[PDB]
Design a protein around this motif. Sequence first.
Motif, PDB file in Angstrom:
ATOM      1  N   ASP B  34      68.510  20.443 -18.342  1.00  0.00           N
ATOM      2  CA  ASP B  34      68.704  20.277 -19.351  1.00  0.00           C
ATOM      3  C   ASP B  34      67.536  21.724 -20.092  1.00  0.00           C
ATOM      4  N   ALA B  36      66.625  24.894 -21.374  1.00  0.00           N
ATOM      5  CA  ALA B  36      66.219  26.090 -22.914  1.00  0.00           C
ATOM      6  C   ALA B  36      65.601  27.211 -21.738  1.00  0.00           C
ATOM      7  N   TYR B  38      64.036  30.365 -24.256  1.00  0.00           N
ATOM      8  CA  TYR B  38      63.892  31.405 -25.838  1.00  0.00           C
ATOM      9  C   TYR B  38      62.553  32.313 -25.629  1.00  0.00           C
ATOM     10  N   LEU B  48      66.849  33.055 -27.488  1.00  0.00           N
ATOM     11  CA  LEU B  48      67.713  31.980 -26.553  1.00  0.00           C
ATOM     12  C   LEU B  48      68.095  32.592 -24.848  1.00  0.00           C
ATOM     13  N   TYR B  51      70.550  29.116 -20.689  1.00  0.00           N
ATOM     14  CA  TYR B  51      71.489  27.733 -21.694  1.00  0.00           C
ATOM     15  C   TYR B  51      71.498  26.858 -19.996  1.00  0.00           C
ATOM     16  N   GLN B  91      62.510  24.161 -23.489  1.00  0.00           N
ATOM     17  CA  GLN B  91      62.812  23.670 -23.377  1.00  0.00           C
ATOM     18  C   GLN B  91      63.477  22.559 -23.109  1.00  0.00           C
ATOM     19  N   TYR B  93      65.829  19.187 -23.868  1.00  0.00           N
ATOM     20  CA  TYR B  93      66.856  18.618 -24.165  1.00  0.00           C
ATOM     21  C   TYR B  93      67.723  17.336 -23.328  1.00  0.00           C
TER      22      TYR B  93
END
Lengths: 119, 109, 273, 293
Positions: B34, B36, B38, B48, B51, B91, B93
């Motif tokens: 999970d 991502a 950027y 971004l 993903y 990141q 999530y």
Amino acid sequence: VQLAQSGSELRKPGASVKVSCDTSGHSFTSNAIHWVRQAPGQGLEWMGWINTDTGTPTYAQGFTGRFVFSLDTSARTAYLQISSLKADDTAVFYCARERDYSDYFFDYWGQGTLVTVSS
Amino acid sequence: EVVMTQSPASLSVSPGERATLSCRARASLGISTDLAWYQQRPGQAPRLLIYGASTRATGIPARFSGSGSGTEFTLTISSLQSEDSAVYYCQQYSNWPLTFGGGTKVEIK
Amino acid sequence: TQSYTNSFTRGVYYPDKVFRSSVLHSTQDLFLPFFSNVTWFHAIHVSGTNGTKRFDNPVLPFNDGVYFASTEKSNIIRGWIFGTTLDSKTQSLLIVNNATNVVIKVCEFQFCNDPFLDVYYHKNNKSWMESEFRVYSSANNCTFEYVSQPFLMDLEGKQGNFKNLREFVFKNIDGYFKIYSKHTPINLGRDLPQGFSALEPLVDLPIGINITRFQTLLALHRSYLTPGDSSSGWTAGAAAYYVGYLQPRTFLLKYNENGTITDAVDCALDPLS
Amino acid sequence: ETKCTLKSFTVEKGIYQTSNFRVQPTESIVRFPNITNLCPFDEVFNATRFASVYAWNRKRISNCVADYSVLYNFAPFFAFKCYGVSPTKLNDLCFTNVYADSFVIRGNEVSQIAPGQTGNIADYNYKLPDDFTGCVIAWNSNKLDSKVGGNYNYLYRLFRKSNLKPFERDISTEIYQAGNKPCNGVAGFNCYFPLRSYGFRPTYGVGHQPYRVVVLSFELLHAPATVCGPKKSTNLVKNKCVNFNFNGLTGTGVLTESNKKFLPFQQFGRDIADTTDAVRDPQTLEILDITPC
């Protein structure tokens, strides 16, 4: 990807700053719009978000009390308010929007708004 | 909570060479891919690029390719150009103290 | 290649994890009897163009704990295998050491064919050797693992005459496995140096089973120090592979004022003792 | 006292030996065993994605120290139902293993999650043994697990061969034979697809709104402990007569310090009379020195 935000503004210390984000340009399958704050010479620091179509803000550990989250009557645009400005609180604010429901990656981003706290 | 770590702090390699950015998060039970990615050019907002585990968003060039699972993640960009001189952030999530990495500054020679 | 030699005063470990200082303590536990004989088993497999069938890993009963000792450079001996039949009808242990890890598991392993060897067996010219693996053939229902920090480590020695002799003693009672390890420096000229040294507890593991079999996994991918002869009965040779068996004897240790063990005496060797 | 220890009202001249002279202790200090690594409970209690009720996870959590006093703020649970142990004393208990599982169901079948129940969810989806012990945690999750248009991310089986075994998950995928016609697959009359999908929506009231439930399973077997509680109480004393609740001493002395060059992996000192004279310090690893009054 290239959402529209407010322009650069200059504010005296201790005052309030108005920040907006245009979002109605496309169709989004999401109930959340996020805001991102970047330090002038450091890394990103996640600030929080406000529940679109519900009006319930979500604050972080160090971004509550003085940071204000709000929405519009039509629930399409997002606004950011900061009060009690300090000299070291200057930063560049960004507006981000995710793509899919239950998917929390910021696929769409705003143009960016820069504020300066000086004399 | 999770204090997300990114190393090295800054890289500056010759254009056209893959640069591996170590993006390790302090997840005891893992993140289950999970992640991502950027990229933040100075001025405008971060954009971004990737993903999930390795798949990229629509319109993202194939040069930006990442991987990783659980704790160890690595992003490799092939044929770096002058327009790629920016700061990359990753990141996770997984839970909901949504936080990003320290940020790695990529410079073009 | 087999040979016999004495084991004068080696094979003593700290009994308990409790501290003592300047006292004479008496205990009762499995121990290696003093002045006993240990058999040497050697390996001969070198050269690629010429060679002979190796058959260099004899399999030992492992009757109520064994004493292990060997002198090597960094990683010549790797891992140990236990069990009772070492087939698909019984469980078998797979203690294997890695570069910076140790892998221990119990499972229903079917076959363990051979360590992968290129048959090159020549380190005199090119000494690039690693990545053999593929010991066991298949696995079964088993969810036990002890991925941990590796046990044996290499000690750097310079200007020659600086080698480390390893000592491992294995204990298996009440369904638990015990390993005591200690690295003894100074191996200049004596194969089994005289003096006194003590082993220390390292790990415990609740395995169980009725292990009565023991296998060695010497890495023959690139070996050295390989003399050969027809030694048998009671003679001397060179193996760098020592095996000794423990008996339930009674000891009496002389704790120093620093808390370490300096002297000991076997209570059933000599009527004077 | 001299009269009392002689049982007489007259004492002739001389010297007598009365009762003993002893300094009574004061204060008290406690310690906890040498376990420090904390348990990561935030993944189970807070996760971004939840599997279906049939895809409920059976995960293993151990090899850490659990802090149950911090999870109260991690979820707005209010029920906290427990069966075989008091809810207040889940900290000072040592357990070898900890069981954790999480799945999403409908609200109407939340009260059914308990031993001794039968029916829609207690026989086709989730069953628990009669001698269960531990606690049950549940909370409302309507605002983050429901869609006004319709949420089909969660599937639940309703046709099955029989009631599945407890502590087990059935993930078979086939078309149930509910008629004389051979239900080879796909669909058709008398051949119904058991994987009916949820339709969580804000229009639903209490009972149909999507909720979240988590249950922790323990067993008090006679196996060595792996996860226990923390708690510190008093820090330390240097020169006083104090009681002990240490890691296997429970002494009473004026322990100041030990300047001896003690061996690293040795904690409890002894002497020629087999008396404890040293204590391993759980925090600074500094050996103390037993000394009586």
